[model samples]
Target: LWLLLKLAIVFAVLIAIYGVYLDQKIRSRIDGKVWQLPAAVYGRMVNLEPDMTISKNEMVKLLEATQYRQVSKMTRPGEFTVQANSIEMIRRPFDFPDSKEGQVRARLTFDGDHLATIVNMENNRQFGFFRLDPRLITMISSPNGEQRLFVPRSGFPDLLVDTLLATEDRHFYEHDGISLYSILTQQLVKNLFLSSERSYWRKANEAYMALIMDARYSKDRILELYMNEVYLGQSGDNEIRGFPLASLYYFGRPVEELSLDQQALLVGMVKGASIYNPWRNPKLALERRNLVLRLLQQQQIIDQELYDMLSARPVISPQPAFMQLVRQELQAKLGDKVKDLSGVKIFTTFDSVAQDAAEKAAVEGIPALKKQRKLSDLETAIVVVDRFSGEVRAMVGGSEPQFAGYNRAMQARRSIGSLAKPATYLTALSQPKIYRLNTWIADAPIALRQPNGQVWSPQNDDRRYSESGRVMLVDALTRSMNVPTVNLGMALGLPAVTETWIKLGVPKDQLHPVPAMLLGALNLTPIEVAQAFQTIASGGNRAPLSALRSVIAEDGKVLYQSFPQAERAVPAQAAYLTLWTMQQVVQRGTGRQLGAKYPNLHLAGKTGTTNNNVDTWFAGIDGSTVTITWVGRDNNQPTKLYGASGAMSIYQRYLANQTPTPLNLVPPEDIADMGVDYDGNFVCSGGMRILPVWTSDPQSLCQQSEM
Candidate 1:
């Protein structure tokens, strides 16, 4: 009996020591819950709140573009509010035990004051978790990687919680991290227990497997981690990860602003992100969303009425609004220029309402013109800007904007035709002492013999000329007379014209100074035209073209900011006079049709039709916007179109959608008004109503101006 008792004591001591060793091993492996890293996901662009004006249609289109469902009723600014239509919401004023405060409500407008036509939200959409292609989700050395981030919980959608709960663990809230009962229940089942291929040590293996997978983290932590690390289905061989990036990769929007239905669908994808990828299997996604909705309804999470209403809406597809491939290409090209700019709180001058109007006008006007002209291959380009700030409000490159190809509005360089005349005249006007609104110029064609053994002759678009007829400078501009402009260019000298083009920001490659250069022989891109026009619209101040307002780093650092710098390129008075004469072009010249539609609008514009009607161009300015448009063939083939007939119609239509805002420009204090005839000589009645023109040099002013 003594020997047996000693043996039992020894056995007990060994068992105790084994238990301690096992516990230590487990502690070492755990490493403090793997640190429970909580990373947020966000889009490359996020539209902020306040001063953001969005058209109702644009908002709907944005939702559709992101594959988000539009529910009839939505939750207001609050935490987890449960109403009839709005069933789920995030916990408001979330306070963590470790932090002072959780993320706050999403600011859903522009400048924190106005609502934009489109707003983006960041939510949980992870790609790495899916275990697909890993390269897409991994960070890169270059700053131009596709990965982006957002704040946790603040902009996350509530439907994510509902859908995950309905599918993964219905009793999640009530259960602790480890559910022992569930493990035992599964083990008790005969099929789960009795596998023919199982080894004799299968029991131990099963326990080990359960311990690894079932070892639970906190409910919130689990969900957050799941979302941040979720798998993206696939793009070719690349696997996309993270909701923030996935939102852009799939819908072209941020995830936080994803509608309830979108949240539900994305959450439903958690079980098998690859298999249920909406883009790959849109029909499957629709069915999955319905399945999640059913679970919500059955569990009394959402009302039957709301479910039915949501069901009636069309299913969202995975197609992104902006072409994903094109975006990727642009990113590759812009590289550092298009890097992560999410954090820089950009304050844009784009009036959402005005932008919407401009877009609508483009869409409506093109079809009308097409129908009227019975033209099938009709193409166009439209660009709108804020005249005061030279901010581009809207840009449409072609008739079928959705179709992918070259962006003519920004890239196509074609002969500007008559549009180049303004530069010549403006250069003349810069010599304030030598030029005025009523300055005399011959309208007849002039043949010249150059020292280079070349004969230069200028002709009108009509192939006819009026000889020895004198015309006021303003009248010559209003009528778009070709002869007078060439004469003025010769009088002003090629050096002055070339300098004007350089000061106006025309590229060196395109700027070739010749007498014909005054008659629109030079080819200029729409973007180049916009740069030149911006100087004129902003009272001779030059502001660079900026598509991006700011760029931000991942750590909430403002890396770069593009502030508007209005550098004076010419005298303000010259710009004003140029603008005033251009207004007459719209009121009575080629753009007169626009005046009929927008009679009260204060606008100034120029029309440009190139040789053989190969290219059509129109550039105009209003109080809030300056726009440049062009139409032509890519192969340089003639389209048989004139500036007013082809592009100006679309230009006018775009302006018609905007408010009748006037361009406010002032002439120099020294300038004064005078009356003159068509010959530019001082005259009485029946002559042109002369306006104030600037002249700094006393010798250049007309002596007998008292008509």
Candidate 2:
């Protein structure tokens, strides 16, 4: 009777255990399905193909500088192309575990569309919310707070699947979500050797059991879930997660965009999020990536030969998220409210080549400046714009680009110093016939006997000069002679200068138009400075600076498209005259350093320095982009840095990064050019002329030459 009772009790226990297992399985499937992440959106900068406006040399330099992954072919037609001498990203491919296979190589060609600009090149890559490991949602609201951009799925590279199987679980496809075999193996190892909880075998068991119930799901679905949920690294308090977001957040690109070498490196990141963080421990990361590749080869995902070749070399991650550290600081200090302006695409006219150049310049100049000045705590701000379109492309706020304390370019207000020369000249040129290039002005100091009986005096930056007497108005302006600029500003009238500032789109209430206004005493942000310079660069057309070109919502709704808009603030001819005179500045004045280094390039620019040399500025433009740089302190203390000595060095470095956009300003029909000695004659002995020069002063010059 007792035996019978024991059998019945055992049967009852067995029935109860089966019931619990069934319930758990059902619950796990539902939970896994519910926790799936929504797809994330991807973005790209679309441009015309066969871009001719940018020279081949410049394009190659840009490619090399960015180390943009080179490819032999593209997959789409209108979306991407490759030509005789051109290469562009093919739709900035989205990363996905199960990407489609479509091969259609098309070469893109562009007639006149050139390098518009690289807006925020240094800190260009920001971590999207999807990149976070805790699997948080990033809410991006429109400018008006009325719309939401759709979250598209961030795609993954092909290597992601192979990496997953090799490193995490070799039999991931064969088993359900939780691998019983792995769990048993882990238990045996722990029980036999008495290993602690830190053992890889123990962790594998935990991970396996947690995912087993839903392992019956499709391979793509499993991979996607693991990617979005995985804990990768800590970029500060934020945890780096999915490969799709990690590529952009850490590498400033999509996962699909990663090269094979990059693929292996990133694969290794999956092992220990912070332990093998590529940005921190690159050598370890390379080892892990190579191991995954070998495993992939063993599984035939990649051939053995290819694996052998890849395994022999170290894997490289894309550009590290060094700038991320900088941007985070900006967001933290400025707060999210102020930094992200809704509805403003802020289409900046920063050429990628120029921006890369600007960053290079800033990075290189800091060391050089530190050598000259005893201070090692040096920072820089650089802003580049389109001469035609009022766009601010590249902005370097400080030495620590990824940090967010003081945005030297956008927030810091530096005195204009000698950089104010162009503004003064432009004010005079607005009256066209009043000041031709041939007009003369004395470089000697003059007391501006004001209406209030106050005397204002101005001095040259050089402090001493070779030609101390009267000089051509253009020459004096180019030389950045403060005395002459003050005289020109007086002649042009303070009202005119003030009105020009407003018409040029400078923020209201920033200036009072004092005598110091002639020397750029007015304080403005780097963005504002870029806008003001854009007016001159755009041939007197005032267009607001833009950061965005277009915005498309997730629902396929076009929120806005920023077209090039300009209003005539000054006559095209007058603006051209100002630009022409400024060219002389780059050729031989305060900006002579530019001409000396880049003699073959044509540039127009001005330099400004403030009282006590607290603020230094250098603003210049080639045919394609306008660049403005300022050097100053956060406390507004004087650096005693001259415009050329302080800011122009950065500008020189920026120019080095850009390929010269061919000069293509439309010349008036009547104005002609002739090559001659310094006498301004048309006697072209050996030097060849190309285009006709224009000027309203018919009596000022006469020549039928090409240059």
Candidate 3:
């Protein structure tokens, strides 16, 4: 009997010691960061103006992406109603990196895609501009496979908190940490034969640990930790670990924005996330959620009327399809940091308008081409950049826009073909004294024997030589004539042409100082091509292309910010001349089809087709946009389509659908639009020919031609 009593006494002492150890552990966790939140990435906010060039369909798509539900009547934030020519929306409040927009009710009238008028419904006042909130593109996943979006104690909705407490722990506020009933039950099970020593000890430790947390933290702090630490559900392999993320994952909404039924649904999910999953077991989830509403009512946390109303609501399952592509993009940007993303906000320069258009063009346009062109297994890549700022607005990697495999926009480096001619021509134009727009160059075919004793001859797409055997510099570039371009490039010297290419943003190593380089022997990705054209698009100002705009730490402190840095890469007059000649390419050259399709649209561009028609490319530019498209087989096989027939179709489709800002460049002081004779001589005044020429002494090449 004495041995039994002594053993009992020893066990009690050991239990007390173990209790203290568990207490310390729980206290440490509660005092420190309770959740490691992954960084949230957002796309650019949609800025709408009275005359903005956006379509109604595109605007509606943007609204949907931002979580605004289409409804017959607007009863809440994130709801919109559309009529024939007007839209009514209750825009949600948002905190941007630079500003904040409070919740507003707006009525907008549209004249086509352009906004005609905007009225603040609350005040009945007119506003000059309005900005829609940015879309939450994706979350950078946290290490350990946990995904969370942290919410401060103040940010939590009172109803959600009350529901959580009523469903998870009834006497949560009253208990010190461990409930009296829990401790008593744990002791009873330990005394019985049904419970193992390990199981009883684990339960006992958990109870005591909760008591420690209650002693060390406030009621609100403990509640905050509980809200963040609770396992809510699963998203693929990632465990959705908090109410904040669970709200978005299940209902596509913020926790603070969840309805009464949604709040009850999340609280009920804590019981059995897998068993009560709304997507898999809708009936079970609805019944469980209704039970939670009854519990809330029984505890006097919610009125009986509210409980009845919420209990009748059906379980709404979330559609996570859009987030899949967004996740891939954010993962690529975050790199290894995605594994441990915590306390960061990444602001990107993604334009949903441009992204939507690019995707539609690729997804719908490719199949049409396949049927008409009789091609199979064709792939394409496109990159669109804001020409003035050099910001990447949209990028489509492959024909499967959603499949995140090879990012051809940044990866597929194929020969640019005649697209390289602009750099070649820009080289000659840089020398104003020698190479005016009317300067003549040979168009006849010539052969060159390489050091390796091989004869090289380049041919035009039509394989027809210029009948005149001589053509003006501007006409050669506009027509994409190969022999004249090669002749001009040879005279300007290969080194000078390469120098211009490097200045326009192509790397020096990518260029080879050979005659073939004049005819696009080198290769570049779609993005590289956009970067090269940005120089000419920006009127010689080179703004380095970037996708990221800014980053903010969890505490709202600015970590990094990006400002557009543009530098003069070429002479303004020379760039203007090159751009003017490029405009002619659209008006009367290879890109003339685009001009014919959109007669009012003014743009400058060039089309390119490589050897055996293996690669087709088109680089199009407007006042503020630069779009580059490439189409071919992934294995580098011939598509048997020229630039105009293949890649230009994509460009044309996008332009026709979207209203673009027209190119309205201001000519430089030394440049003048004057007449030139057919013989490549300057006609001083009143002549049939016209071209942009430098205001230098025309005496050297000026000649009178009979009318």
The candidate maximizing lDDT is: 3
Per-residue CA lDDT of model 3 for 519-546, tens digit only, reads: 9898998888899999888888888877
lDDT by residue (tens digit), candidate 2, 99-149: 322322322233344532222222443211111001111212223222222
Clashes of each: 38, 63, 1
How should the candidates be ordered by lDDT, best one leading? 3, 1, 2
- CA error at residue 514 for candidate 2, angstroms: 2.3
Expressed as tens digits, the lDDT of each residue in 1-707 for candidate 1 is 48777898887777546645544544554344322222121121223233334333433333333233444434432222223221222213322212334323222322221233121223432111110000111122113322333346545667655555666453433334435555221221112223555665665544543333235334354444345556555544444545655554555435655556566666667557777766565677667766776663545554432342122211121112112322333354347543334322222222334434545665677677667656556566666655655555555666665443656666667788888878877888877767877788887868888669988887766756665576778878887888888888889998888878887777878877767788887887676788888888888887765543433343445444547776788878788888888888888877776666665665788887877777877888876567887777667767656455677777666655543455655566666565555445654334466676574433333454453
Give model 2 RMSD, 1 decimal.
9.7
RMSD of each: 10.0, 9.7, 6.0
- Looking at candidate 1, what is the lDDT of residue 121? 29
Choose the strongest candidate by TM-score: 3
**Order of models, best TM-score first:** 3, 1, 2
Error of 2 at 127 (Å): 34
